Subunit: 298 residues, 2 copies
């Protein structure tokens, strides 16, 4: 496992997608270190660039520590490592604690991540799958790969129960990561449906796909539209606390697409100001759901 | 001076502002290392957070190497160091070469940066000034500072001719970094003027100011509007080569501002497809020009 001391920089915090962007770069580094392949320059046998695409992404914090807690110069301890998911994919976990936290030097513990998460630590799960394009300049119909050098044989095992697959399968079906039958919540009747042309000035990565962190900005763009429709103020929006968020990346899209962003919310009937917001990103033209996200806020 | 081996990551390339975002984080690190102060957590004697704000920013490359050249997994060598600009500000330079480039291990050379820049290296100049807010939650009327611990006494001297001040003074007056009387260019008659409400989902940093790299996205948003008005295609826009770009940050803005982005272009009468594009960002409500940028493209 990889432990690092991190002081929070402008390029990894704030109300945008910079933190999630840093998290994914750490993911690519941690896999490179544990899987004997340079993930950044990865190509298949043929010479085709192969990308370790984000597929399932979770960030879980709490009141004591969440992404909105991080400010310039915060001292953090980050512990990272991969878990075996076979030859075509890999799960990467990252734990973040405030430096000099009680027990901050803890090693990665699957039981802690999946069943006993502590208020005051941030837990990150990135389930990634190697992909290539099926055709130059197309971002649709990407094809599963495994770069020749990729080695999952050194990695620790994950037990069947902690499988990200069961998690994301259920989310693609239900369009939420939190079952509608969860007790202690009531749906609100206002929803929103926003058109979003791909933003080529902002949304595009260095290999001409939609950048994984842009999905989090698109999701927040929908949350904002629904926030506003509820009457609420730009100001209180920036005060929103996100204690948990899950994202499934079902597809990418060509750079001329017009996407649709739909959002709904359930309000706690147990705690005031606790809310579960569901966002679905569709590419209506290809009949594809390309993303689903649930956000647990306060 | 600080030399690093860098492999290009998703979080520092592409047609957005991720490269400039990485450049500024390197700036804050390099000053922290050469000036005996933790720039990330900097505060004045009073306890007030003090920010090493970007004020003048230049990225100069060329055909052989420019920001659009960088792709995932590119091996680079980066050399960084600061130069004395007194007690309230500091100039940071970064040179970027392809790793195993001829002479890539070169030390920083002011003569090379300012008068003999080589095709095949990227030269970055960041002139930064320490500032604090004048009032909580206000992004206007920021006030000059120097964190108690800041030390410029170890740093190398810059000769009067290489002064970023003369450069940026002239740009605030002329609204371009390339004098209108430059021979070998003809102005085009199409210009554009776009309204841009501050984007709170994207544009905001972890201390609630407009993030310095967002200015580059706002500038590109104006370049795009003018690009399109010239008839041109989203596709050719992504093929634009930027061989040089300068930015002056005259102010910040409150998070409810509606900004105006104006753009014009001069076409080479010496080379086809060589163009100089000028963008001015105004906050009409406060009567303030907050940014000016010139881009030399191909
Ligand atoms: C991973 C992926 C190729 C799986 O393909 P699929 O059609 O669901 O399943 P098959 O393996 O049957 O083909 C597809 O879900 C996908 O392209 N996901 C998007 C990943 C992505 O773009 N992430 C953001 C950029 S890294
Ligand atoms: C630096 C600054 C305070 C200088 O103030 P000024 O009014 O030009 O000059 P005075 O020193 O006379 O006051 C002002 O130009 C400024 O606030 N610049 C914006 C810097 C910025 O926001 N950068 C992006 C975010 S880091
Ligand atoms: Cl990406
Ligand atoms: Cl900033």
């Amino acid at each position: 496992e990889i432990k690092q001391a991190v002081t929070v920089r402008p390029g990894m915090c704030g109300p945008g997608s910079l933190f999630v962007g840093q998290l994914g770069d750490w993911t690519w580094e941690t896999v490179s270190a544990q899987c004997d392949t340079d993930v950044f320059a990865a190509r298949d046998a043929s010479g085709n660039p192969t990308f370790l695409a984000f597929y399932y992404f979770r960030v879980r914090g709490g009141r004591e520590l969440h992404p909105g807690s991080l400010t310039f110069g915060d001292r953090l301890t980050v512990t990272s490592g991969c878990y075996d998911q076979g030859t075509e994919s890999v799960l990467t976990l990252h734990r973040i604690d405030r430096a000099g936290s009680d027990d901050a030097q803890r090693p990665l513990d699957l039981h802690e991540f999946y069943e006993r998460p502590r208020d005051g630590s941030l837990y990150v799960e990135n389930f990634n799958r190697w992909v290539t394009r099926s055709a130059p300049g197309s971002n649709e119909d990407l094809v599963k790969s495994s770069p020749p050098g990729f080695r999952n044989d050194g990695l620790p095992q994950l037990p069947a129960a902690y499988s990200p697959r069961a998690v994301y399968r259920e989310a693609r079906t239900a369009h939420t990561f939190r079952a509608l039958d969860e007790p202690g919540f009531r749906l609100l009747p206002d929803t929103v449906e926003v058109e979003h042309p791909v933003d080529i000035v902002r949304d595009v990565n260095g290999v001409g796909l939609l950048y994984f962190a842009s999905y989090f900005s698109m999701v927040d763009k929908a949350a904002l539209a629904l926030w506003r429709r509820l009457g609420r103020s730009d100001r209180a929006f920036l005060r929103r606390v996100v204690v948990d968020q899950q994202m499934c990346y079902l597809g990418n899209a060509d750079l001329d697409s017009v996407l649709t962003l739909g959002a709904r919310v359930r309000v706690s009937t147990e705690t005031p100001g606790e809310e579960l917001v569901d966002v679905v990103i569709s590419d209506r033209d290809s009949g594809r759901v390309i993303a689903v996200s649930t956000l647990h806020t306060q």
